[PDB]
Design a protein around this ligand. Structure first.
Ligand SMILES: C[C@]12CCC(=O)C=C1CC[C@@H]1[C@@H]2CC[C@]2(C)C(=O)CC[C@@H]12
Ligand SMILES: C[C@]12CCC(=O)C=C1CC[C@@H]1[C@@H]2CC[C@]2(C)C(=O)CC[C@@H]12
Ligand SMILES: C[C@]12CCC(=O)C=C1CC[C@@H]1[C@@H]2CC[C@]2(C)C(=O)CC[C@@H]12
Ligand code: FES
Ligand code: FES
Ligand code: FES
Ligand SMILES: [Fe+3]
Ligand SMILES: [Fe+3]
Ligand SMILES: [Fe+3]
Lengths: 369, 369, 369
């Protein structure tokens, strides 16, 4: 009769897939950069041609942190004894010795530079990514007609990253936590992707930058995880008689199985006749509206319990199917089963919820008399 | 020849019994309140009639912290998706859905409202409290002739709560740590209670509010634990020719097996002809004198080792019998043995100690010339 | 092909040997002093004749921290109930009782007062130190012709103390981390000692107090660990036509197997015709130059990985032989093998490294045009 919460320990294994480490522009300063991810530490640095390299951060000589070193030429120089390591992981020079042991080779991670971002491939099995597991090129990025990224990040301590992934099915929380108003909500999972289609409006009683200065903006969203960690969200807003195109990133990487970094950011297509500056300000506003919602999630996650047996209502999204899909990335590729990857679609009938949320928004308006 | 300290790991099991969570007045503000106890988290809230309810804090939908929610009607509303939970643990409404799953029932803890306090019943076996395991009604509380509580609390990190319980037999430390002067000291353990009878005086060399502005006040104390965690101490002071009646609470709850909350507080009987205000100031002073002693204990506990094999002198209280009594609350009721619960009495002959403490207080007086 | 880092968990066992706890002058204030070492806590205090005593800090009565007590006579008085413990570990008085249980005896550690320092003997097997395992008397210490110690300390969190010991063979890091310029480098390990002989010069491009105000000072160093934790370094500098004699301590004690205290300090022989004050200022300057290098090591250690399989170059010192020697102190004396203790000598041919470091220092000079 009393329902109890069940929760297994978070896996120690990290998701197999592409993970965005951040913006190319932040990494292309010619300095080394430290990334604590997947239970270890990595070093990111640009070579003299500007290509980004990602190595295990721990120097194979005496364990020094390469990310606290310095770039010299096309090699990263260790701060402890200045050995030089290139983008292939090869030690290219021990500056105080004649020869280099041939076995001096560390791990260079597989990278992708795309969409103004740096992605790395994680796989505990150690295989390269298949050609068909990739990150889509966002068509508009880098054209004159779109802004650069307004980009933000948040460090979440005390939660496993499944907590963020669960949101792809959580229609109700976009009302309570993101202060939007969902009207249509549909999920489709298939292969290594998970998609949410939503149509929402702003709420009258709460003001958010995501509405682009129209409290009743309709927003059409197609949001897809391409693998375990990286979502692209294509949005179109009808705000004050205009149609605005926004592309929002929602992504993360695990620091450990109890800590992750959440990065999110927006580009906006320049409306006819608006300057670069005005468009950049629309991107920034949209990103700040997203921030508000994510900071609320952070408070939810900070205080909540993990739960493997959530009790779902009739108006809930397909959490269990999402989780079964997500599990593919935590088993060897050989152990993947059809029920993880088979096409699964579910649409929530929102008519109940909309009735209720309208009453709520209305009597929160009456709340001025 | 070298004596070594032995100490088993602190139990993971929490004491079976009534635990005071705090003052009703603090909980009856219509807001939810978070309590981290017994290795979990609880939510306390008043319904619309003012009755207090205590539930598991973790929402059975998706794990949300109910204690960061809001009270609506007679239900607590989860901050994540606003499901409503009543005092019986029943989900009364999913505001955006037509129906509620019948299996939506969480744990409502058994409570007691008494003595201006809220108590909850803990039992890992999951049974209700027997009729004869209860908290005494303090006769004077809530009458015109007694004050309300002057109440204080302290959070102790890095100790198991047995450390506070041990004090019920520790005559000597009331001199060194509490700066009183014990003259008579007797213990009686029986059933689920443990009692200390003491007569003490203030020390000349040290000034304390517990002496009510008479450095030589005699104090008669009857102090009893009613179960594992909650002590009521009935005190009568003869200070400046008056007889003052005080009732002191000393209680705690375990946060984890290495952290606990200590709450203590006093009511004073109004002397003939004194105002409510004057009496409240006597309660506050008494509570501040107790605080001094407890803050010293905190320093003792912060730095000490746990010890299962204490080496006792002739003037020590019956630590081992106290601990055997205390063990009853950490075994199933079926496994309780007669030697835990049998009447056991021991009186310390204080004549040695008094001689010594007088010399000490005297030569600390001479300490002005 | 990819080389991986291997690292076993740090031992839980602590090194057998003499460990310096600090300066006698700091301990001879008549107050008790707390030392967290070897996974436990110790109390240091002077008796009424000024002799230092070291006991287990945890009182055998009820676990009180003796190091937060007070010295009375030749005994330390516990802060909880004022029992008195002498330098032999014997309880000498329970001030409020007639008798003391004969079995009231705690652990007095074996100490040495020498070189203005206090050393204690650690051995998990519980044996006394053999006559031939000792700390050398530094001839000059306490004579008119030498200063007292300029002494410094650093607390290192998140590293095992093997990290500091490894430096005895690490020629290259004296250039990159200590900003000296090694010209000759030789190790000899034998018995319970490990020695580094080095000749170095200052670097032009970097200024350090260790050069005594001559940027090209030659320095001759004989540095020896006498057991696992304590190194004496005899130095002679030829700076601005003078010959300066310095003796530098480099030592530590383990707090836990992941935290240690590093203490280091210098005495200087008074040059003909210089005052005590001028000599003390040379000691202080030398100590501050050492500090600079050690603070850099702290940054190296803070960020590095532990590594049991370091990959060594032709110009590396004999790390593996050093570690095998060091292992003697973590096995029972009976289990020591000849390969740990046999004489082993290795000299690095520095000619390669010197060429390279000169180029580097030179083009860092050109770095002003
Ligand atoms: C990116 C996102 C979060 C996590 C997730 O899993 C799916 C989505 C898609 C909808 C986005 C939302 C973030 C907040 C957005 C911008 C709104 O305020 C309305 C639409 C909504
Ligand atoms: C409440 C208490 C503490 C813990 C315990 O176990 C038993 C007692 C009873 C005596 C109280 C004492 C607290 C300090 C008091 C008020 C004094 O200063 C003299 C009498 C003494
Ligand atoms: C004490 C020490 C550190 C750890 C070790 O293992 C061996 C030595 C001996 C050489 C000392 C060095 C400390 C820094 C010194 C003073 C210099 O700047 C040049 C010589 C060098
Ligand atoms: S640890 Fe990297 S060069 Fe030595
Ligand atoms: S987690 Fe409580 S309503 Fe969803
Ligand atoms: S604990 Fe040291 S005297 Fe009681
Ligand atoms: Fe969210
Ligand atoms: Fe106490
Ligand atoms: Fe060093």
């Amino acid at each position: 009769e009393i329902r109890e919460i069940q929760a297994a320990a978070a896996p120690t294994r990290f998701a197999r897939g592409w993970h965005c480490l951040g913006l190319l522009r932040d990494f292309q300063d010619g300095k080394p950069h430290s990334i604590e991810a997947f239970g270890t530490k990595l070093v990111v640095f640009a070579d003299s041609k500007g290509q980004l390299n990602v190595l295990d951060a721990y120097c194979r000589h005496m364990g020094g942190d390469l990310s606290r070193g310095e770039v010299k030429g096309d090699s990263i120089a260790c701060p402890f004894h200045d050995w030089r390591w290139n983008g292939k992981g090869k030690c290219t020079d021990i500056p105080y010795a004649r020869r280099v042991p041939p076995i001096a080779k560390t791990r260079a991670w597989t990278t992708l530079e795309r969409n103004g971002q740096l992605y790395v491939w994680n796989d505990p099995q150690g295989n390269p990514p298949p050609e068909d597991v990739t990150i889509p090129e966002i068509a508009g990025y880098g054209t004159d007609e779109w802004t650069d990224w307004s980009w933000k990040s948040l460090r979440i301590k005390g939660s496993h990253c499944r907590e963020i992934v669960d949101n792809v099915v959580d229609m109700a929380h976009f009302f309570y936590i993101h202060y939007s108003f969902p009207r249509y909500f549909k999920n489709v999972f298939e292969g290594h992707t998970a998609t949410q289609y939503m149509h929402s409006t702003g709420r009258e009683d709460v003001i958010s930058g995501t509405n682009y200065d129209d409290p009743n903006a309709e927003l059409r969203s197609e949001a897809t995880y391409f693998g375990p960690s990286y979502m692209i969200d294509w949005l179109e807003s009808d705000a004050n008689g205009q149609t605005i195109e926004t592309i929002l990133i929602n992504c993360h990487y695990p620091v450990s199985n109890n800590e992750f970094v959440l990065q999110y950011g927006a580009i906006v297509k320049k409306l006819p006749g608006v300057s670069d500056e005005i468009a950049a300000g629309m991107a920034e506003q949209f990103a700040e509206g997203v921030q508000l919602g994510f900071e609320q999630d952070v408070e939810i996650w900070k205080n909540k319990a993990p739960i493997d047996n959530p009790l779902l209502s009739e108006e809930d999204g397909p959490v269990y199917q999402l989780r079964r899909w997500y599990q593919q990335f935590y088993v060897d590729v050989e152990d993947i089963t059809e029920d993880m990857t088979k096409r699964f679609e579910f649409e929530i009938d929102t008519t109940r919820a909309v009735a209720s949320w309208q009453k709520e928004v209305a009597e929160n308006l009456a709340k001025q008399a």
